[PDB]
Design a protein around this ligand. Structure first.
Ligand SMILES: Nc1ncnc2c1ncn2[C@@H]1O[C@H](COP(=O)(O)OP(=O)(O)O)[C@@H](O)[C@H]1O
Ligand SMILES: Nc1ncnc2c1ncn2[C@@H]1O[C@H](COP(=O)(O)OP(=O)(O)O)[C@@H](O)[C@H]1O
Ligand SMILES: Nc1ncnc2c1ncn2[C@@H]1O[C@H](COP(=O)(O)OP(=O)(O)O)[C@@H](O)[C@H]1O
Ligand SMILES: [Mg+2]
Ligand SMILES: [Mg+2]
Ligand SMILES: [Mg+2]
Lengths: 20, 371, 371, 371
């Protein structure tokens, strides 16, 4: 099987703003 | 203390509180699982997208209708849809509200039995009732006589009723419906080069059918007109550009309703089954049925169907009788309107199937006088 | 306990601890052995110069890259580079830190298997994970969809991902990258008078390419202008004096990316490979990929590529759709930044390959669902 | 005056005089233009090499197939192919012989119309007739009924015919054919190290597929065996040496036919679409179609496909009824044999499209009763 991403919750697109 | 008027249908689940004029939530009845691999982690992507949420991610899902022709073929999917409808689309607990479901006539009884059993066992609803899909539409129009043609999305039936009395021996059902029209439109749209195969593109073809297809008054004359003129050339914008041009195909899709031999059906068209059903009933109320012909189902929203159907019936009917077709503008929600009206009636307050009745007689109580 | 995110690539090794903003150690990935005799005794002469030292003493060395096109061809040099990276650039023992390697898509399986075996037997790491080099690049932008073209230094691969679901059947790989551009530049510099042959001078040509080359917006008119006017001819200083003047070779070397017929390659340029990989995707997610194209890799750092790409894609794609090319200022480290972000996630803590699993199943464990 | 039973197909043009058993001229349908410079003078280098000539000089050409999936994409190249077939490979004038073209079912009618226009305008054939690629294959078998699955190199089309009557509502067409299998073989051969990019090496890949690939009786058992044993690895020699060893890729390549989920296509395999088409037929003719399944086309020449097909159909079909697969050994040339048989019939001699009828009625006569 491909890499089955385990079931989490979140998150993204806040890190980019924080970095900028 | 309020009643819930649910309408399963096949393709557009419509639900809302009783006593209103519009349903609260209308969403497609589709359950779509993902098909690709999935590499990014932490997205919290669920394993089953249902309802209106699933029609936004059709690219990475396999949308699947759990209802083929009225009947239910995947009870797990229908349970998911009912749970999503009751808990997320209405935000109303099912434990303190009656339920009024609708069923197409002449279906297998096991479907109704399983429906009632699931509704009473898992959801633990206080009381539920199953009603005929066309009688509710007839009640919604404020009348009490005539024959109703309910061209839904899965099944097309004709129900004649007179002064509140139905005729079980004159009900004509045909499995031709909007789904077959969509399939035929997809099949004939390949003659120009545009090929749709994926189950997701079926919804694109369905949208094209809703926005463009129409019923011609005269089939052969219009087809001859389209071969020389170019006024029927209609353009449409696909969800990624590359507009397409539909010519005479736009009125070949609904022509299947009148000539089912296009899709291999041996049976007759819609205007002929109604005529046969009318001639099958008593000779004393034929004129009343002629005077109270009412269309139902969303599929009867095609531009110009009520005129060609009227012309065909008038040609087939004797010249003395007068043929009128009642076409309410809100024929899409007519069944839900009838359910809302019926749930508010005081005389109907005692026809429900109480929880005690189910615990006493089991799910088989549906087949009894108490439907 | 922090994680080690090493990103070998092909040409520049970038390494640093998880959770930082920029890699702590970046250096060219070359191993340089001496080729002359040596007459002074006891000068602390080494038997192989690795890392950035080999390009400082590159006068008497024969630099040999250990990775030709993504695939690793000389394992001994790779072991030398990994040892120098761990012990001398970060000075951290490998047996007390997890590792996150990155591998180009569509690589031979033996490469990954041998990489895992070396990392588990020689350095004896607790747990290591291999990830596709473009997924981290997409992680860096903070998005969850889009098509990322990671035109690195050894291989150029274009991976589209929608809502975290990658499309394995639409991955397009081309072997034209910075190394072949450098070779073509070294070949066309002989048309003016300067000849570079030995492997030590390929670094000089690489520096010239990095410092002077630029991608023209339109090729024909720019070529016509550069052959008539004299405003583009720019001068450069070689490391011994002897300044050179490059004219139309500035924009002709990077033009190969958009027109691989210069080196005789069969495939189309990177402006048509992206569109072809987009069109291979389903019809519903083409608009989002059109509006969310992402660029990455060192070789996409040329001044004037984001506008040429936009113009070419607009020429190819349907006119109505909006086309946006994302070009973050930190394109070079986008993959490593994505890797650092990935290694810091909480849900990622159970994706590592436990050493017990390797001992139970051998190096072929990487191909399993544990990627 | 004899008839020319031509069969353009897609990838392999077969033609010859009517009444024979095998085509006199069979050659790949490729149009090849030079791509390198060319410096020698007086060599008589033409600007386009087609047919078998392009299979001897493919090193310095850019081969381009003119038929992608049934549809025609380069009309000038197709004209060159027909010109080479008539004037060069058979040495017969077109003005003195009728012609029988072959067309795949459910294709755009514009292609058929333009084919007729090209045939009657350029070559000035006395009469031409287009025939469905499945009816001819059924005729060649010598019977009159059955369901024929003719998976050529462009399309895989399944047509059931009963007592000489076709069922237009039961024709299932998939775009998965030999070309996509070749592409998948190219994509999986990069897992070992052998990378093919140029369009000329695709011919080497096709030769490998013809010579070594085979269909497993059971996919999972063979896949598990191939990872432990080494009895499946076969060696092959490229045109310059470099012997390569194929392991489990031999049966992973043709498995895409029964599992189109490998290349991302949504449609089911060829084992299930035929069964679905059979179920679409009436309930009174299903047993006969079960008993007379007929295979043809090049793509059905894999050793061991008739066993997998029969096993899958028997698993799907009801247990009692018999399933018999008709797999003639010369199934590759089946369509040409059927065309030769049909053109030699006296009853068919009155079904041609007369030149005067096209002249007075235009190219659109083909869609009419003369079809
Ligand atoms: N405006 C419209 N014009 C033409 N066809 C329509 C229109 N709206 C809906 N339809 C067809 O009717 C179907 C919806 O019918 P509906 O009445 O919702 O079925 P059900 O009885 O299951 O609720 C759709 O699948 C569509 O094909
Ligand atoms: N500023 C720049 N301008 C033009 N080209 C560059 C620039 N920086 C790096 N390159 C090219 O990119 C290559 C480095 O690419 P990189 O992203 O490090 O590859 P990898 O994916 O192996 O890390 C160098 O070989 C050089 O040719
Ligand atoms: N002996 C064989 N074994 C496996 N595959 C074959 C064999 N011969 C031909 N093929 C495949 O079939 C294709 C030829 O199919 P063909 O029947 O000529 O197509 P068409 O219907 O266009 O004539 C080739 O491209 C090849 O991939
Ligand atoms: Mg309905
Ligand atoms: Mg890189
Ligand atoms: Mg064929």
């Amino acid at each position: 099987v491909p890499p089955k991403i385990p079931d989490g919750e979140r998150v993204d697109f806040d890190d980019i703003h924080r970095k900028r | 203390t309020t009643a819930l008027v649910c309408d399963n249908g096949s393709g557009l689940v419509k639900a809302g509180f009783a006593g209103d004029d519009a349903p609260r939530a209308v969403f497609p009845s589709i359950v779509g699982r993902p098909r690709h691999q999935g590499v990014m982690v932490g997205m919290g992507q669920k394993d089953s997208y249902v309802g209106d949420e699933a029609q936004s991610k059709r690219g990475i899902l396999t949308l699947k209708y759990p209802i083929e022709h009225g009947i239910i073929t995947n009870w797990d999917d229908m349970e998911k849809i009912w749970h999503h409808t009751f808990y997320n689309e209405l935000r109303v607990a099912p434990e303190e509200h009656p339920t009024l479901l609708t069923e197409a006539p002449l279906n297998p009884k096991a479907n109704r039995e399983k429906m009632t059993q699931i509704m009473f066992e898992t959801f633990n609803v206080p009381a539920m009732y199953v009603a005929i899909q066309a009688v509710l539409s007839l009640y919604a129009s404020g009348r009490t006589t005539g024959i109703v043609l309910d061209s839904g999305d899965g099944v097309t039936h004709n129900v004649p009723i007179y002064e509140g009395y139905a005729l079980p021996h004159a009900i004509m059902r045909l499995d031709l419906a909007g789904r077959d029209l969509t399939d035929y439109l997809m099949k004939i749209l390949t003659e120009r080069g545009y090929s749709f195969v994926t189950t997701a593109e079926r919804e694109i073809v369905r949208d094209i059918k809703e926005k463009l297809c129409y019923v011609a008054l005269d089939f052969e004359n219009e087809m001859a007109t389209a071969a020389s003129s170019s006024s029927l050339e209609k353009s449409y914008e696909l969800p990624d550009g590359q507009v397409i041009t539909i010519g005479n195909e736009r009125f070949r899709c609904p022509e299947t309703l009148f000539q089912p031999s296009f899709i291999g059906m041996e049976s007759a068209g819609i205007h002929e089954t109604t005529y046969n059903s009318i001639m099958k009933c008593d000779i004393d109320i034929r004129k009343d049925l002629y005077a109270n012909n009412v269309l139902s189902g969303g599929t009867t929203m095609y531009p110009g169907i009520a005129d060609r159907m009227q012309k065909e019936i008038t040609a087939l009917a004797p010249s003395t009788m007068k043929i009128k077709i009642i076409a309410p503008p809100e024929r899409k929600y007519s069944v839900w309107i009838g359910g809302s009206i019926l749930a508010s009636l005081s005389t109907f307050q005692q026809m429900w199937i109480s929880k005690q009745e189910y615990d006493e007689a089991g799910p088989s109580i549906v087949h009894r006088k108490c439907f």
